[PDB]
């Protein structure tokens, strides 16, 4: 029971999400190998994802985390890139969407940098790039990212050589 509602480009909500995308691109140490070579995006569409059940699942967990963390959800908006983006919007996140070999263990990973999440659109390490051209730096094919509401609760701080 997911619906997707288009945001008008004239709408401040669209513009806020576009600026979050654009302002958090950076250079990557692979010179663009995984995600491609770019300084900015062409944003083609932004849709709101609405699902009453998935939303309730989320707010139920958030309340438990918030109470366990002395009344602080520690909620953020973060990017997620995945080959499963089309499954995620219908069924929600679960173990099928985890990065088994991640830096900080098997869990679901999110980025403040839009361009970090873009590295996973076509799979781990960018996989073999777009389906049509096998190009990790394809400038023609349309990509999708999610911008998500994430409950962090008490977060363990791990400094990392990356």
């Amino acid at each position: 029971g997911t619906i997707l509602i288009d945001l008008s480009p004239d709408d401040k909500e669209f513009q806020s999400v576009e600026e979050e995308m654009q302002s958090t691109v950076r250079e990557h140490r692979d010179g663009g190998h995984a995600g491609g070579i770019f300084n900015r995006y062409n944003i083609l569409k932004i849709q709101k994802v609405c699902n009453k059940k998935l939303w309730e699942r989320y707010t139920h967990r958030r309340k438990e985390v918030s109470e366990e963390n002395h009344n602080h959800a520690n909620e953020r908006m973060l990017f997620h890139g995945s080959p499963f983006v089309n499954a995620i919007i219908h069924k929600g996140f679960d173990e099928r969407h985890a990065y088994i070999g991640g830096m900080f263990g098997a869990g679901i990973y999110f980025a403040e940098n839009s361009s970090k999440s873009n590295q996973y659109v076509y799979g781990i390490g960018g996989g073999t790039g777009c389906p049509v051209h096998k190009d990790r730096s394809c400038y023609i094919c349309h990509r999708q990212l999610l911008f998500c509401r994430v409950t962090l609760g008490k977060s363990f701080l791990q400094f990392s050589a990356m």
């Binding site: 932004i46 996140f93 970090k116 990212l145 994430v150 409950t151 977060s155 363990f156 400094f159």
Partner: protein, 47 residues
């Protein structure tokens, strides 16, 4: 799927080498995220 560190609900990966890199975050329960926006885009070739 792995478990969050004892008493914690997520991990915050803070890059310590590259100063322009922002943080990455891991959760261990899918219920702790909601995919609020779907963004369709192309990367752009620099000029």
């Amino acid at each position: 799927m792995a478990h969050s560190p004892p008493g914690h609900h997520s991990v915050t990966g803070r890059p310590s080498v590259n100063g322009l890199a922002l943080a990455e975050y891991v959760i261990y329960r899918g219920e702790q995220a909601y995919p609020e926006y779907l963004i369709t885009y192309q990367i752009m070739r620099p000029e």
